[PDB]
Amino acid sequence: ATFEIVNRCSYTVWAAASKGDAALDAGGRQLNSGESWTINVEPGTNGGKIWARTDCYFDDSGSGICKTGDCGGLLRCKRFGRPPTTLAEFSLNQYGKDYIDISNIKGFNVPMDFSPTTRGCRGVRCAADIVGQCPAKLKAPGGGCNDACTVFQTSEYCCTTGKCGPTEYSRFFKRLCPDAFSYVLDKPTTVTCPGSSNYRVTFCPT
Ligand code: NA
Ligand code: NA
Ligand code: NA
Ligand code: NA
Ligand code: NA
User: Fold this and answer.
1) Distance 193 CA to ligand 2 centre (A)
2) Which of 6, 160, 162, 190 has the fewest Cβ atoms within 10 Å of its own Cβ atom?
3) What is the count of structural domains for the chain?
């Protein structure tokens, strides 16, 4: 399946793509303002994610650091990124269908739209100014708006036991972005698409 990743932000981002234990395609690449990078994701990929990283430096071997979304200091991500990270999430060819969503469970760094480029289903978007409106206690000094599990490490925010409810913090993310997951047990905003659809992830869509 193809995913076109487009940076409409005014600043450079380093895109990343991983399924947690391996890179998807090359795993990461720099996108200057306006640039597009198309990756190929194997059919059947379960639990894949795409995100933006900000304020990165990499040496000529591909090793360095980013202030949001860093994946073990690699340009070409093999693992998931360090919060805060707005997440485009997907599982492909699961009993004939694809499933997509956007999640704020690991915080928010960059606004995003995640839409199919083929027929049969709708896209989802979280493009509100979550960083600007972020509650004081969730602001990350390194940049972005952390989720409450990252900040406070409680069973209630991290849903450790699989029993948890909404919180003042989760309701902030849900108010600004109703169509994204705000906590682990949120009422799902997953979209079902035809199996083998293709997609576009756009950073700073508005
Ligand atoms: Na992101
Ligand atoms: Na969603
Ligand atoms: Na997230
Ligand atoms: Na909530
Ligand atoms: Na898009």
Assistant:
1) 13
2) 162
3) 1
